[PDB]
Amino acid sequence: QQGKVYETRTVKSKILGMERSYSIYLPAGYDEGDGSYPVLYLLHGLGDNHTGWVQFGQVQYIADKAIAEGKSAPMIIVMPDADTVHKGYFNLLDGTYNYEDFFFQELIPHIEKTYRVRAESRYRAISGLAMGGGGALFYALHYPEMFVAVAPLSAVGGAWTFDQMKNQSDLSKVSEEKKAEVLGQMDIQTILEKSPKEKLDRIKWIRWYISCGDDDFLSVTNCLLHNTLLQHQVGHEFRMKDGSHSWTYWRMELPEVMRFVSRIFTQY
């Protein structure tokens, strides 16, 4: 019936020079047997931290329920802290805080070393809300070879995030050529035009689930996102449901995301 959540553990980070918090959900029966589990990475929005999906998202109750009902297979859920010191998911322009490198080169290997994890792309999915939707969306466009499924909920656009990366950086130390380079790497249109054939095929191979409420100011951002993906022939599932920019929407979508990624993990 019931799994458990740890909120106070950390990963020793040399790239960020600190102990980084994360939360982790372990499914019921993680402590019995010796088997391993797939992992869902679940990213919070602006203002919250690694307790957001725990306290507001009610991840323990919602995942316990979905797994016991058979709506989802057992999985591990990992919730990073992207609020302490700097807010956001990407490497800053001044070179002083490379959070994206921390995620792929330190957090993911730590999870695989510490917990009983199936450590392959086919067992790794990523999702998030608002700021974390943009995080999940662009993590997968940068490293499509790391994920099998991606689920941006109420996702911010590339322009919003690049604005956050500039406001968070010391712009006196950043040249104009470097601003132009990262601006292009945070634009969904430019990434798809400039991707080599191998990259674009991995992007088409990823299973995408993109959802947003219709009374959300981000509905326009996500309708433009849907049109861009069809224009580049990236098949995906797209939902615009009754809802707003609120935790009512995200607690309702969480079991849908789990059912979506769980079927990819188990195949069908």
Which of ligand SZQ, a second copy, Ca ion, none has residue 167 at its interface (CB below 5 to 8 Å by kind)? ligand SZQ
DSSP letter at 234 equals: -
CB of 253 to Ca ion, least distance (A): 15
Spatial distance between the Cα atoms of 253 and 156, rounded to a whole number of angstroms: 17
CB of 17 to a second copy, least distance (A): 24
DSSP letter at 73 equals: -
Q: What is the SS3 assignment for 241? A: strand
* 214 counts as binding Ca ion under rule CB under 5 A: yes
Spatial distance between the Cα atoms of 78 and 23, rounded to a whole number of angstroms: 6
In order, the DSSP letters of 162-173 are HHHHHHHS-GGG
CB of 24 to Ca ion, least distance (A): 31
Q: Is the alpha carbon torsion for 17, 22, 26, 31 positive or negative?
A: positive
CB of 13 to ligand SZQ, least distance (A): 20
Residue 51 near residue 104 (C-beta atoms within 8 A): no
Q: What is the SS3 assignment for 6? A: strand
Q: Which residues bind a second copy (CB under 8 A)?
A: 1-2, 4-9, 23, 28-29, 32-36, 38, 51, 54-56, 58, 60-61, 65, 70, 73-74, 118, 123, 214, 219-220, 223-224, 226-227, 230, 237-242, 246-248, 251, 265-268
For residues 30 and 160, which CB has a smaller minimum distance to ligand SZQ in the complex? Answer: 160
- The site for Ca ion (CB under 5 A) is made up of 214-215, 237, 242
Binding-site positions for Ca(2+) read: 214-215, 237, 242
